[PDB]
Structure 1
Amino acid sequence: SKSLSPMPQIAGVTYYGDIPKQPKRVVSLASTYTGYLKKLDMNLVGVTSYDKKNPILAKTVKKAKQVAATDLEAITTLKPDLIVVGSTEENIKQLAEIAPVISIEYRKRDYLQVLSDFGRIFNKEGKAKKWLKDWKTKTAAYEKEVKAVTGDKATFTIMGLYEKDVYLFGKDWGRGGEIIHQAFHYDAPEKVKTEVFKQGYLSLSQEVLPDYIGDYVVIAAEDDKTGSALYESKLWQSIPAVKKHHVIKVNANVFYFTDPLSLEYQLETLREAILSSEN
């Protein structure tokens, strides 16, 4: 009985059932996408734990219930007309019995394309287009502002800390890489381009970190103590970028994401942090 989405065929997008064009009660089970749906003025009745822990996005979804993909009863009771999942979810069959499902395979469309793709699915092209135009202009302007500080050839490395582990990231695996490498067009060290960019991420032992850091490093973490032992180490303190105060420590609870709401916060945060590196 719902007016239907035109359900365009788009790389990475799979539809289960007849997707509504104008869903009124959306459950997002994919934190990668929740804020895209919010930007397009969807009514989110269910979101994920990650969404509730995202201090920027959470402010806009207070009325949504936190749910996990296993919460068949809670999701049913929310009476959704659309469920959104990532393609690695394992109970899509059961979810699609509750409501139509859109399943997205990560990385098939880039962080900007995802928004315009949802614009086509929901006939919200104008909202997507306006946001994307503003983003293009603003990021070009900000690229000039930050390269006025660093120079145009400065290298950046994206890093994240989790538990006792260290990771590097490329241009399209979160942690600020989309803004640093795609929006600001900062280069990365050669070793990062060669070893990290294709896969998107790389597990590293701490002792080799100096070899992967050039001018600047952006480091994501979920709490301000995860990195404490690393930061006090002689190894870390030996790195030229560290000596120069070219370390930018960011809050992973928002910096994991690439939705428009998270990005707006990240963009201003990174712009200000690059300026502040020269205080």
Structure 2
Amino acid sequence: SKSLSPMPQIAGVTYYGDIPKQPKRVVSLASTYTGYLKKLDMNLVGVTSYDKKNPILAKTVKKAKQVAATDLEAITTLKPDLIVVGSTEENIKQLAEIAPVISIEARKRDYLQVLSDFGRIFNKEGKAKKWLKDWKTKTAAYEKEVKAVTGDKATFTIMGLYEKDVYLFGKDWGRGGEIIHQAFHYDAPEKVKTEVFKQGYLSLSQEVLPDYIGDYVVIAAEDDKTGSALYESKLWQSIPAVKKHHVIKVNANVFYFTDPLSLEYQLETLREAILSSEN
């Protein structure tokens, strides 16, 4: 009974059932995509725990219920007309019995393409295009502002802390890499480009961190406690970027994401942080 999406064939996108063109009750089970759906003015009736913990996105989905993919009863009761999932979810068959499902395989389309792809799926091309045009202009302008401070050839490394572990990231695995590397066009150290960029992420022992940091480091964490021991260590304090105050500590609860809402916050935050590194 619903008007249907044209359901274009797009790398990484799989449809289960007849996708509505204008869904009225969307359940997002993939925090990667929730904010894209919000930017295109979808009514989100269910979202993930990560979405509720994203302090930027959460403000826009207060009426949505938090659900997990296993919550077949709760999701059914929300009466969705569309469910959105990542391709690694394991009960897509059961979910597709409740409502049509869009399943997206991460990384097959870039962080901007995902928005225009949803524009095609939902016939919201104008909303997507206007956002993307503004993003292109704004990021080019901000690139000039930040490189006026650092110089054009400064190297950046994207890092994240989780529990006792340290990770490096490339240009397309969140933690600010899309903005730093794709939008501001900052280079990375050679070792990061060689060892990290293709896979997208790399687990590292803390003792080798100096070898992967050049001019600046952006470090994501979910709380202030996680990095405290690292930051106080002689190892960390010996790194030139640390001595120069070129460490930018960011809130992973928003910086994991690449949706438009999260990105807008991240962009202003990173611009201001680079300016502030010379206080």
Structure 1 length-normalised TM: 1.00
Cα-to-partner distance string for 1:24-74 (whole Å, 9 max, x where unaligned): 000000000000000000000000000000000000000000000000000
Q: Distance in 2 between matches of 1:32 and 1:88?
A: 13
RMSD: 0.1
Cα drift, residue 123 of structure 1: 0.1
CA distance in 2, matches of 1:170, 1:50: 22
Per the alignment, residue 103 of structure 2 pairs with: 103
Deviation at 1:126, TM superposition (A): 0.0
CA distance in 2 between counterparts of 1:194 and 1:49 reads 34
Distance 2:249 2:119 in 1: 33
Looking at structure 2, the residues matched to 199 and 29 of structure 1 have their Cα atoms a distance apart, in angstroms, of 25
How far apart, CA to CA, are the structure 1 residues paired with 2:154 and 2:225?
28
Deviation of 1:83 after TM superposition, in Å, equals 0.0
How far apart are the structure 1 equivalents of 2:2 and 2:20?
6
Aligned to 1:241: 241
**Pairing of 1:46-61 with structure 2 (within 5 A):** 46-61=46-61
Shift of 1:10: 0.1
- Aligned residue for 2:85, secondary structure, equals strand
Q: Mark the runs of 5 or more structure 2 residues left unpaired by the alignment.
A: none
Deviation at 1:222, TM superposition (A): 0.1
Report how far residue 236 of structure 1 moved.
0.0
| In structure 2, distance between residues paired with 1:148 and 1:61 | 37
Aligned counterparts of 1:261 and 1:237: Cα–Cα separation in 2: 34
Q: Match for residue 15 of structure 2?
A: 15
Gaps of 5+ in 1: none
Query: Using the alignment, how far apart are the partners of 2:7 and 2:57 within structure 1?
Result: 27
Cα deviation for residue 219 of structure 1 reads 0.1
Partner of 2:36: 36
* Alpha-carbon offset, residue 97 of structure 1: 0.2
1:75-107 per-residue CA deviation (whole Å, 9 max, x = no partner) reads: 000000000000000000000000000000000
Partner Cα distance (1:257, 1:16) in 2:
25
Q: What is the CA distance between 1:122 and its match in structure 2?
A: 0.1
- State the distance in 1 between where 2:135 and 2:12 align: 24
Superposed displacement of residue 258, structure 1: 0.3
What are the residue-to-residue correspondences of 1:206-221 with 2, within 5 Å? 206-221=206-221
Deviation at 1:218, TM superposition (A): 0.1
How much does 1:133 deviate? 0.0
Q: Deviations over 1:228-254 (max 9, x none)?
A: 000000000000000000000000000
Describe the SS at the equivalent of 1:167: strand
| Cα distance, 1:132 vs structure 2 | 0.0
CA distance in 2 between partners of 1:210 and 1:93 (Å): 46
State the distance in 1 between where 2:125 and 2:224 align.
40
Residue correspondence of structure 1 range 180-199 to structure 2 within 5 A = 180-199=180-199
Q: Tell me by how many angstroms 1:143 deviates.
A: 0.1
How far did 1:201 drift?
0.2
CA distance in 1, matches of 2:108, 2:99: 24
Secondary structure, counterpart of 1:171 in structure 2: coil
Q: How many Å separate the matches in 1 of 2:258 and 2:212?
A: 24
Give a deviation string over 1:102-132, Cα, whole Å, max 9, x none. 0000000000000000000000000000000
Distance 1:166 1:258 in 2: 21
Structure 2 length-normalised TM: 1.00
SS class of match (1:76): helix
What is the alpha-carbon distance in structure 1 between the residues aligned to residue 223 and residue 70 of structure 2? 27
Correspondences of 1:1-279 after superposition (within 5 Å): 1-279=1-279
How far apart, in 2, do the equivalents of 1:151 and 1:205 lie?
Answer: 30
Corresponding residue SS for 1:127: helix
Moved over 4 A (4+): none
Q: 1:211: how far off?
A: 0.1
* SS of residue matched to 1:62: coil
By how many angstroms is 1:138 displaced?
0.1
